Amino acid sequence: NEVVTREYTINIHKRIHGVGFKKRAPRALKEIRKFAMKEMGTPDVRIDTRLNKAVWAKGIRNVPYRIRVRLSRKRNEDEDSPNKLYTLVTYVPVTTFKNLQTVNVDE
Amino acid sequence: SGAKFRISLGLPVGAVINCADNTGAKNLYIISVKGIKGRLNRLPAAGVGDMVMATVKKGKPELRKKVHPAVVIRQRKSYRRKDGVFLYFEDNAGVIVNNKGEMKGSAITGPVAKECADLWPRIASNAGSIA
Amino acid sequence: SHRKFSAPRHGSLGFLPRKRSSRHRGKVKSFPKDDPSKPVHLTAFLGYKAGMTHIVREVDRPGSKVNKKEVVEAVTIVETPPMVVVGIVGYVETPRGLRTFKTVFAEHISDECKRRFYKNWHKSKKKAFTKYCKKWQDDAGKRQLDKDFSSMKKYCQVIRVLAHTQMRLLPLRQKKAHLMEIQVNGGTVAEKLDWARERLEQQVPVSQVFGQDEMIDVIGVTKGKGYKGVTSRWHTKKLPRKTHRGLRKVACIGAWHPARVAFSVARAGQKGYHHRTEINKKIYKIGQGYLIKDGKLIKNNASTDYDLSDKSINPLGGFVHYGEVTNDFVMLKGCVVGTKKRVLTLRKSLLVQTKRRALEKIDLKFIDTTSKFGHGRFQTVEEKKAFMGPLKKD
Amino acid sequence: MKVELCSFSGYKIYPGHGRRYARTDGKVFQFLNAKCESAFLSKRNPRQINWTVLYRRKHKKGQ
RNA sequence: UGCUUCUGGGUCGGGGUUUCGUACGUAGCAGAGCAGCUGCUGCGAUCUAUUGAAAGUCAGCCCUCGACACAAGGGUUUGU
RNA sequence: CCCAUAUCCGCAGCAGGUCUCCAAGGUGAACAGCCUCUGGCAUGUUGGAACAAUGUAGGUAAGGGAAGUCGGCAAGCCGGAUCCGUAACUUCGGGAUAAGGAUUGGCUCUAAGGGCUGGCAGCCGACUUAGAACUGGUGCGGACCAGGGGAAUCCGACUGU
Ligand SMILES: [Mg+2]
Ligand SMILES: [Mg+2]
Ligand SMILES: [Mg+2]
Ligand SMILES: [Mg+2]
Ligand SMILES: [Mg+2]
Ligand SMILES: [Mg+2]
Ligand SMILES: [Mg+2]
Ligand SMILES: [Mg+2]
Ligand SMILES: [Mg+2]
Ligand SMILES: [Mg+2]
Ligand SMILES: [Mg+2]
Ligand SMILES: [Mg+2]
Ligand SMILES: [Mg+2]
Ligand SMILES: [Mg+2]
Ligand SMILES: [Mg+2]
Ligand SMILES: [Mg+2]
Ligand SMILES: [Mg+2]
Questions:
Q1: Which residues does B contribute to its contact with D (CB < 8 Å)?
Q2: Strands of C337-390, DSSP E
Q3: Long-range contacts of D34-40 (CB under 8 A, 24+ apart)
Q4: What is the spatial distance between Cα B46 and Cα B114, in angstroms, rounded to a whole number?
Q5: Taking a C-beta distance cutoff of 8 angstroms, is the pair A7, A68 a contact?
């Protein structure tokens, strides 16, 4: 179970509450990366570019309130890396955030 | 016997209020307030029921260029009562009186605050309505 | 030369230094003077600031403008679940002042109280009092305890109990209990110790310490506000807008001589989080906590003789930033120090209360339980649902 | 203490809530909050504001 | 202040509360009129119903015990 | 080759100075301001975390309204356009946007204002103006742009330096 995938909703709204306009989206990324490390316990967190695009899709200050993400913990193929597992964060387009839970995804 | 309670003061010195009687004066310009000891840099302030010293800026010539005793009957600044009600009026008004507290005129236009009416029976008798 | 116009100085030099309180829990500096002719009783209590509301009552003040008239008065709700007496501490009068003489502790102490003895409960083995407790369990140790009690009867002049709070009944994150000494006033010293010894490990409700319409003192730490300038800390006049180098200042901090800044001049620093003792806060109501009776939750502790609605003291949505008050509470007129969740020390009056305002009897006609999270306009959810009718959620 | 009704929104005002307005023509109004007060003072008709009691009655929403 | 009593906090969800004020779409022989075809079909700000709707709401709001994982750890010191 | 918030002069990759040519769409009177395309850049000699005082630069404030101060300094008010209206005084040119009012959105229409081919017919067209209905929680020069006014006294005619 080192390799595992789960889906989460991250309440970006309470993560960046009170942040300045020019730091709001840049801090959402830092909060997503911080979220991923906490859940998967993996210092090597790689944010997908599409997830980067979703967070910035409304500019630097009007960041989306909620965002559904998939956390895949994968083995690292670089023998030179000090970390043997890395977490990949991908964007999940959802129409509605109502009633969404944390679910396991099996491939 | 029953003393009035503190209310918010909305009329510092220099406030020009309406004159709500039939004396002839249109407005009253407050130059001081009765009973104010005050402190450094603090303007004397007046609320409903307070006797003040005022001049007439607009009105009959005989009433202008002299100091009258007046009483504030309405104020635009909202003041709390002991029943928790915050009351305010559409305008700031007063009536010219003498040192004894009896009106110089005979009629009052608009309502009169209950705080002033209880304190000045001569003004109360002339009030068309009480708030 | 003399200052041109007279003006009183800003602030009181009697509350100096304006520093951060060394204690988070309010300290009783003076207990009420002991009167050996009264029955044994406690003189203080611990409660937690839940929040503020307002009430309606008819005043009884002959010769007043509000005699036989209803008024709206603000009140503070302080949640005061029963405390547990866990020890007795004796004091001996010496020519250097009171000196602690002997402390005894009950055989059992809950984990809430034991948490007080640790800085890291997680990492601790919870060894506190594990060897002291064995003294009550054997004949040799028991024979030493009563000797300690006998010694306290011979020599001590002041007796205090060690009561702590029960944090498992409050809605707060904190689980460590607040433990304080309460002085036992009343009869002889022997009667004090007999009274205290029977109450080890027992619970003491607030109703056994205070009563309705009683004037008490509230001791606590004020809300902290951090580094503040003289304009906010001391309330000095703002300098004109043209001032170069800032106007939220005191322009002259002293004369040439003495060639020093005096202790009586306003300076920047800590504002708030000060220890304070406030007196003459009347008790408007000693409310009962929730009870399950015949399978029904009885919680209408906010009902009055004139309002029979089955509602608790909690406003709609609960007490903002506090939680839900499901324990006994004391309704204090006006405001008290501290934030929400702050632990307040309740103390009996050091004065003789002979004044109409001190002796007036409070009869609440109404207690406002509207939501404080906004401009709430409904007293109860039943009242709201009846006004609105069915909604899309239904 | 009797409960007033907001002159604009028709909601009822419990003691120690809202404000009272006395106009120079002798009419006296009670307002639940500054939102109801602001609408009344800007001469908005309550029968067109969806959340008032006069609107819902006119449009039979409760009925 | 918190960091295993099948317990703890945390995240998400749900509910309460509260703010604004009635969402998109769909329907309407409601709409000042105008255009084309012999009453119908188009364009049309707005109006009505769905719809006190939609949206937000602790980040320092209140209650959950639904879902998810995590939590029995690490470092430096200290002795009459 | 640079031709200038880094190739020049100011001791320097210095917010200063230093002569020119070309010059898109929208709004608008407009080379105004605001947004965009072509072309260009990486925030101006560093970053991270906090969000105390005191600052610098922006705002908002109940009731009063210059009581502040040497002094209304500062800020604030006014502001576009259309229609109406406009005094003292005057060197008859002005004063004058004197002062003072009203109006302004969206949508659906009505009328008027032309060219070419052969008092008429057909075919083409360019933005304008005026009027009317309807319509929104009276909001409409909705951002941007954008005069506060009046009564006087002294001095110097004015524009210019
Ligand atoms: Mg002064
Ligand atoms: Mg002196
Ligand atoms: Mg200067
Ligand atoms: Mg509140
Ligand atoms: Mg910058
Ligand atoms: Mg940079
Ligand atoms: Mg540079
Ligand atoms: Mg720089
Ligand atoms: Mg103001
Ligand atoms: Mg105002
Ligand atoms: Mg002056
Ligand atoms: Mg002065
Ligand atoms: Mg100026
Ligand atoms: Mg002029
Ligand atoms: Mg002259
Ligand atoms: Mg000149
Ligand atoms: Mg020259």
A1: 74, 78, 83-91, 93, 109-111, 128-129, 131
A2: 343-348, 364-367
A3: D35/C375, D36/D6, D36/D7, D36/D8, D36/D9, D36/D11, D37/D8, D39/D8, D40/D7, D40/D8
A4: 16
A5: yes
